[PDB]
Amino acid sequence: DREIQRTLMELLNQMDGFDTLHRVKMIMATNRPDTLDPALLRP
Amino acid sequence: EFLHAQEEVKRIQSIPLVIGQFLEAVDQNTAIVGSTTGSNYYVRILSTIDRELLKPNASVALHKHSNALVDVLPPLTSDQKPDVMYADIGGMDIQKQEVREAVELPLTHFELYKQIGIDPPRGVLMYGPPG
Amino acid sequence: LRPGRIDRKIEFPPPNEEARLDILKIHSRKMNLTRGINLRKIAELMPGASGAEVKGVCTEAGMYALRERRVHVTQEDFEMAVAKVMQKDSEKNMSIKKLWK
Amino acid sequence: GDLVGVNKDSYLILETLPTEYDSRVKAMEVDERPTEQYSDIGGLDKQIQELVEAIVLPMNHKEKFENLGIQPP
Amino acid sequence: LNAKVRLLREELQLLQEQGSYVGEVVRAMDKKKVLVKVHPEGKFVVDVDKNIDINDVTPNCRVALRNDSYTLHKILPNKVDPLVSLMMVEKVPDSTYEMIGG
Amino acid sequence: SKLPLVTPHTQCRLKLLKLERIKDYLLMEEEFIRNQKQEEERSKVDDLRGTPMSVGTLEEIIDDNHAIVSTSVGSEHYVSILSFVDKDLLEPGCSVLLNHKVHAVIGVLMDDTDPLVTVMKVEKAPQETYADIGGLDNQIQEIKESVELPLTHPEYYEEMGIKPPKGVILYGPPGTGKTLLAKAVANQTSATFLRVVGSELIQKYLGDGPKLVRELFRVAEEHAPSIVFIDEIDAIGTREIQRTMLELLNQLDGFDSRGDVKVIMATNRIETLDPALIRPGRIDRKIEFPLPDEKTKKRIFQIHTSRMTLADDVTLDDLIMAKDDLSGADIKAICTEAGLMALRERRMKVTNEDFKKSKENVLYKKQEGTP
Amino acid sequence: SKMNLSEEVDLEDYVARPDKISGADINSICQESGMLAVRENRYIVLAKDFEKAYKTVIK
Amino acid sequence: LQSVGQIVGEVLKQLTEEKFIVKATNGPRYVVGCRRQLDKSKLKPGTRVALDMTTLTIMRYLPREVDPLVYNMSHEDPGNVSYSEIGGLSEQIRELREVIELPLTNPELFQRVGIIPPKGCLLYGPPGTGKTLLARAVASQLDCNF
Amino acid sequence: DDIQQLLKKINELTGIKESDTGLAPPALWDLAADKQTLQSEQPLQVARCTKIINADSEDPKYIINVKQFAKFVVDLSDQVAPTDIEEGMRVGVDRN
């Protein structure tokens, strides 16, 4: 349960590392968006 | 002969050397170091090493075989680095001045304001509509 | 507090005039003060301080010095500081003299 | 993501291995092949037919489904 | 010059010797045998060398060993570094009665 | 071992004489010790186990002299056992010495893990005694018949055919002397004493409650004659906490044979406890600790103020009187508070007025109700 | 400024208009107008793009 | 058969033009030197390099790890699903193609317009409405690395 | 006070109380058999067996999963037989 939060932190850091130039885009799909951490919800 | 001997001393700390972390010194000729292999060892210090560099967490280099401490290596968390500048802000000049006095000068020059003796600034409040 | 348990109690009422004198002196000991200061008027002007807010008044006088880039404090600086330290003027009609009068 | 047997010291690859998932996963495999007959089941004939048509028929033929174009359940 | 040369030579000869590990003793179990725990090698029983002063060797001594056969070498300084308590403990604080007023 | 007991307490020549006799004997021990083979067995065994020897954990024994052993690196090894290792001292989980080179099993290391109950083993019971507790005569007899006499003299019960009582509950107002009596009975019979106070067995993890109960009773069995004192049984006793109750109840009267361990539990609120916890088949002795009466209160005052220097004027009876509203703990608080009052006035020798003020203040430390 | 925009963009209209929109709303309007411009494949942002972005957002 | 494997490891600070700090994958931290001839400028913190497992000297800076988990996470069959197989999601397909396809297919639009393209999209809904299908279609139609 | 200090002195003079390991009654044990067996046999490591390759039922080539150490492709000694070993089986394995 710990490793999942520590990994979400790394996902957040790698996501925020997106410079404007990369031709890289991302899709996330879920059936229970309420359970999703509000950290991701931030613009 | 002394030139030969000193050349050998220099030859001791040549590559490859295993990096580790410095624990507190024991005596003038020895100290305890924890190699990056994970293990800890009680190791002779090479007498050429300048002692002042031996901070209790410094990164050091040890002989690969004997683990001999032979070199001292010369030494952010996230996107917490904001990467945005006052040039990017849309002209909030009054707020720019207020915040810059409130935090920026305390971050840069808190030692003078400690010389004032005031426990230099600790907290500011920002209020207004969102966005 | 039952007798076999913890044995004693000590009361800490808000600092009085003499206590305000001490605390102001102690927290001003490090600050660059100026002749012509009258700290006793300042202590008299702050009725019912809790002690911590006197550390606050020293802090605010120093902040007034600092935001003006002055490394010294004067009587006026402390006097406008105390105004910021009032903060109990936010009582007003609500419950000031009604209900919980 | 392959499984290769390499030299114990020089670490050169000198064998290609069948992938191994896990011991528990192999324990999940049926080797005894139990024996309870369909006749031993009573009253469940409709449920039996549903399960059979859903599972066995795709294994048996695949022609009756593909002739219709449906995805078998 | 000769003294310096001799110094360097003996230094190199000692530099050939390995790192002798670091361990902490859990229980002395009579002369010539003492138990010590070392990083993840684990807990080993070891015969003490000629210095033999075992009653000096308290538990948790941070004692040094031999790199081979682990033979006890010397007691080393103690491991204090009480950061486990120091996250919370205030040690001996600075607060003193003269800064207390009233 | 410890020094004997010196039981004059007033500073008198008798005390000095007893201390002098202790001094003399200890000096003779000094003299004796200061005033000063098996090499074949050594060269055989202590050289087969050539130093250094590692420490690992025995997992299983497969043959008469072959065992499976793990080490701190987590590896697993099938290795023979040399003949001198005591087989019956070897079991799964046992810490075992191993030859460094070929991992040979060369002796069991006496256990130094399971630290929780390891510190839980009190061994510091000798602070109290039946003498130190006064006035609990009927309760003393009850506890003696229940837990003590079966341990000291099981002979009567084996001759009679009785399976002796092996679980007791103590109840009453706090400060009446329940924990005191528990520690005193722990002292009178030198069977080892284990304490675990109520809510401290309650734990956040799903396991540690019942697991803690299990290892507590396991260590109690291992020490064999032992006392398990469950203080504040209330917190657990009044699904998970009920499961901890279930494990404790099963360990009290369940499968297997429990053996010699005695169990004494203490509560303030007996009427609130779950009837299952008070198993009338298991909890066969319920002992009330009521508030001390006049004779008792006199005894408690005497024992607690005995070690005190006293003036002439103290009217001890008038100190007692009242309407028996104070337990023994309140009396000890009275003693300490009177001592403080005497010290304030500089009296190293307490007086009656000290006790009067002490009792008045302590009684003022009661109640809050206006009407 | 970092965007392209056309010569006919009338910023003063949105400066004077009553809606009490925030700076975050400014950024949202500008990004959305650029997105409308990209939607029509037009490489430059027109006044109609700002119009549609302004009315598309806020209240 | 005469050949011997070299030890892989990530590199760190270049102490000098010759002494470098490599970090063997799940291993210790060393200070080592490049062999003789390899470039030194490209040896920057974050370049996978092979190490001779006798002197640990740097040789053969490798491009970067693929981590076969990721290889499986790319070379996976998404199906032949086209947009004409998803139905009733036309507005949502428009949004997804506008946020994920167009910024990739036509980055020069976002270059000239100067808009920072949205980084990613979140698909949410009840189970079995087409989110995974949407992703499958985007994978099967856009000729890229998925 | 002198009682206390000289009690520490007694503790120091008598030294640390001996800690044992368990060497049974002396008459029970040893014989040359113990040392001979120690120097002659092999302290085997323990492994899980896995994926009996059985590429020809002639060179079986079983995989092993020695825990916390490694996994190897290995063969039987001249003593054990193919019918003895199965997949899993928690086999024992020589150390070199």
Ligand SMILES: Nc1ncnc2c1ncn2[C@@H]1O[C@H](COP(=O)(O)OP(=O)(O)OP(=O)(O)O)[C@@H](O)[C@H]1O
């Ligand atoms: N709009 C649609 N057009 C065609 N088929 C559809 C549509 N929506 C759903 N389906 C069908 O319904 C099923 C939905 O499966 P899919 O895994 O794509 O759903 P999901 O809701 O994205 O999944 P999840 O529950 O894993 O989040 C598929 O078999 C797909 O063919």
Ligand SMILES: Nc1ncnc2c1ncn2[C@@H]1O[C@H](COP(=O)(O)OP(=O)(O)O)[C@@H](O)[C@H]1O
């Ligand atoms: N005056 C401004 N100039 C430019 N951008 C702004 C301005 N005010 C807010 N923003 C936008 O708002 C975002 C930061 O959010 P912010 O407004 O600080 O949150 P809050 O609602 O807590 O004030 C930035 O991405 C920035 O683009």
Ligand SMILES: Nc1ncnc2c1ncn2[C@@H]1O[C@H](COP(=O)(O)OP(=O)(O)O)[C@@H](O)[C@H]1O
């Ligand atoms: N009959 C008694 N004789 C002597 N001391 C007593 C007696 N009753 C209570 N005490 C005092 O009360 C304390 C013990 O209180 P106790 O009732 O054991 O606590 P708890 O209520 O937690 O079990 C001891 O310090 C003891 O001095």
Ligand SMILES: [Mg+2]
């Ligand atoms: Mg899905």
